[PDB]
Amino acid sequence: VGDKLVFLEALERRVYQATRVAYPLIGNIDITFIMPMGVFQANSMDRY
């Protein structure tokens, strides 16, 4: 990457294999959402 040299690991290597443990790196993301039901038009320019 770029001009340097780096390495990386993983959770699917020989270690941490077939282990009955909770999976790490778990996060929950919640975003507020709005929900209308139908608003009638107020101007007459939207029906022509």
Binding site: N43, M45, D46, Y48
Partner: protein, 46 residues
């Protein structure tokens, strides 16, 4: 001096369009749109 900007004389030209962007160059049923002479067309995000 002042370059002619882009503006809408009313809010009824958004009738016909394609994809996900509104299409109205210079004509309307009862209004008109001034074309932007300046090359600053990187506005109005989708």
């Amino acid at each position: 001096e002042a370059y002619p900007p882009l503006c809408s004389s009313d809010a009824a030209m958004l009738r016909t369009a394609h994809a996900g962007e509104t299409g109205a160059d210079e004509v309307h049923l009862a209004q008109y749109l001034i074309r932007d002479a300046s090359p600053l067309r990187g506005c109005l995000p989708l």
